[PDB]
Structure formats: C-alpha cells, structure tokens
Design an enzyme around this catalytic site. Structure first.
Site, mmCIF file in Angstrom:
data_model
loop_
_atom_site.group_PDB
_atom_site.id
_atom_site.type_symbol
_atom_site.label_atom_id
_atom_site.label_comp_id
_atom_site.label_asym_id
_atom_site.label_seq_id
_atom_site.Cartn_x
_atom_site.Cartn_y
_atom_site.Cartn_z
ATOM 1 C CD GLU A 121 41.718 83.571 11.352
ATOM 2 O OE1 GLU A 121 42.773 82.999 10.995
ATOM 3 O OE2 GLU A 121 41.730 84.699 11.894
ATOM 4 C CD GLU B 270 42.674 82.280 17.104
ATOM 5 O OE1 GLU B 270 43.447 83.211 16.779
ATOM 6 O OE2 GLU B 270 42.257 81.425 16.292
#
Ligand code: NA
Ligand code: NA
Ligand code: NA
Ligand code: NA
Lengths: 211, 211
Positions: B69, B145
């Site tokens: 991220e 994820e």
C-alpha cells in the site's frame, strides 16, 4: 461455398461472412483418416484453392474456413499455410481436432459451455471463460457453432451474452442454425405437410435431427 | 521482516513464505507521494536490500515482496530490478498501484472478487477469472489478501476455492488475517477484558478494525 449471388447481397446489405471450403469427412473412423492421408491432399487442395480464387474480392468475407468436422490432419496445416500466404488480408479458422490446433487463428469451439467444463479425452470442450486463460493461450475465442436451436430450445442464451460482454477476448459466436431443413409432402386431399428424415422410405436415417 | 526464528521454524515445519520489506505509506495523498520521490529512494532501498541480505538462505522464502500500500512509484521499479538482479532464484511481487504493474511477476490483488467486477478509476479490481484473460496478460494470479475475516465473516469462501481448482492460472491466495489484534485491560475488581482502538484514550482511532 454458397451461390455466387449470396456474397453480392452480403456486400450490399452489410453482413460479415465466414466462407467455408466444401470439406467434411464426419463419418470416417477416426475423423482425420482422409485429411491426414497425403493421397487425399490434391482432392482437398482443389476445394480450398478454388474457393479462394472465386471469392477473394468480396469485402463481406472476413474469415476463411478450411471446412468442418474432419478431425485434424497434416493436410489442414498445409492448406492453412497456403491461404496465409496468398491472402494475408483475412484470418483463417478451422474447428476440427479440439478447436485450438495450429491450423486456426481463432479458438472456434462448437457447443462449448459458459462455465461448465466437458473434459472429453483428446478433444475436450472447456468452458469458454476458462479456455482463454489456459497456460500460454493468447488468441480470441468465437464459437463457430453454439446454442443448438432444435425444437423448443435456446435455454440459457442470456448466459453466453453476459459473458461475451464481460470478457474482451470472448468475441461472440454463430448460432446453429437459421432454417429448418424440412420438405413438403401431400395427402389424399392435396394438403401439404412438413417432412423430416424417414418420410421418403430413406433408411438408415436420423429422423428430426435435420430441423 | 519477521523475528529471525520465524524463518527457521518455517524451514523445519514446512510453510511457503512471502518475505516483505518494511515499507507502507498508505496515508500519503496520493498513495505514491514518497515512493515516486527520488529523495526517499535511499531510505527505501535500505529496507529492501537489508532484508534480502539477511534472509536469502532460508528455503521457506519462495517470494520477495516490495512492501504494501504505497501506490506505484519509480522507486518500486528500481528496487524490483535490484532484487531480480542479485537473486534470480525467487519471483518478486508487489500489490500497489493496481496489482499488475511492471513491478510484479505475479498478479496479486487485494480483495478482488470471483465473478464480480469492481471497475474503480485507475486501480480497478477485476473478477479474478476475467483478470487472467485480459488482452496481452500471461502471468499467474495469487491474491495477496482476500476473504476479510472481521467478526462474523468468511461468507462466499467456497466460491474462491471452486475457482482456484477449475482455473490453472488461479493459484490461491492469503486470507486476511491470522489473529485478532486485541489487548488486555484490567477493571476495578482485577478482571481482564479484550480491548480495541480508542480504549486507551487514543484519538483519532479506528475502533475494531484491528480485529
Ligand atoms: Na467481448
Ligand atoms: Na442437424
Ligand atoms: Na488453479
Ligand atoms: Na485491520
């Protein structure tokens, strides 16, 4: 190859056309017994080469086809290459031998389903969504025959179209088929009625499968 | 990067490891404000290189990861090529910037769905089935994820595994996540209870999103 006037009409009204050589050896055991045999190559070549020579100037013809349901023989590979060489302007397709052989520019299965695999030995019909993403595969997929409209049919048609829209590489297909092949017969009063296989004393036959 | 004993234990018990560098800049606007800035390259490189120098001999480590991220910036590209150059034994992955950039060997989205497209601007999360067969794409897909297990969760989990089995290039993923991040507090009578964000006077906080 169709009546010459058909191409004219498709040029003028606007329709895309698959032009197909007069080659189908469905009943052979196995299906490629003739098309893998170099003694049947000249006979096969004349059916491909004379089509290309007659029809190569119609704009409505966008894809060439090597025939149908004749398995995959080395004759197909030779003829695929002949076309790619005299006319680079059009993709070549052919279905036999598993829809994705070295003799076709377009993965063209017949009756492959949207989500469900049919894993036949040697010539499986994968779900079309799965087929595009098989390791190392890059070509576009366009069903050469799908949604068999025999009798009260066409159930699940929406399912193909939802997939065609969602997947860029799923570029649609050709419904089988346009018009019932029934013939006319008459009773004792002169009333016509529609006939299928068997109705002429013709035997062996395959009954209503022509509709 | 984890406690060094973790790797030894994974080697001995048998688990595949994704070792990930200590870089996350989720809170910048836009997400790549630092990772695209050459003046933050020195600090970033040290976090990737010092990881590879420490863990490169553990067999459990099969994949390198550039962090998480931090959008997609030129520093990710440099450091990607640095790893491939010093350690060809292992693939490099990075999710940031849309999950399929030039800085990843593996399409590795977070929370992309099985059948459902989420066509966000610039960083769309495609259905994993669709993502594989995008024009020109050839890479394997493993979710970094998926299946967010917050509270009463994991609905639709079977839908992933059905897809994983049917599609060769869909090769699984990593559930988010293993263990609840609650902490123990004590009350007046000396009894322990489980606490989450805010329960320490901490403000601003994100309440129970740590579980
Ligand atoms: Na499409
Ligand atoms: Na028929
Ligand atoms: Na798989
Ligand atoms: Na969280």
């Amino acid at each position: 190859p169709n009546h010459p006037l058909w191409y004219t009409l498709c040029d003028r009204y606007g329709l895309y056309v698959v032009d197909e050589a007069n080659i189908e050896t469905h009943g052979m055991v196995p299906m490629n017994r003739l098309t893998d045999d170099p003694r049947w190559l000249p006979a096969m070549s004349e059916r491909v080469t004379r089509m290309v020579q007659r029809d190569r100037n119609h704009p409505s013809v966008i894809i060439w086809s090597l025939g149908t349901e004749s398995g995959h023989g080395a004759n197909h590979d030779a003829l695929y290459r002949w076309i790619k060489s005299v006319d680079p302007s059009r993709p070549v397709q052919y279905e036999g031998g598993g829809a994705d052989t070295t003799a076709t520019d377009i993965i063209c299965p017949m009756y492959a389903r949207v989500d469900e695999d049919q894993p036949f030995p040697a010539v499986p019909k994968w779900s079309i969504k799965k087929w595009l993403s098989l390791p190392g595969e890059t070509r576009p997929l366009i069903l050469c025959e799908y949604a068999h409209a025999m009798g009260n049919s066409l159930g699940g048609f929406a399912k193909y179209w939802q997939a065609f829209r969602q997947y860029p590489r799923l570029q649609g297909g050709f419904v089988w088929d346009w018009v019932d092949q029934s013939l006319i017969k008459y009773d004792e009063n002169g009333n016509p009625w529609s006939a299928y296989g068997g109705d002429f004393g013709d035997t062996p036959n395959d009954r209503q499968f022509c509709m």
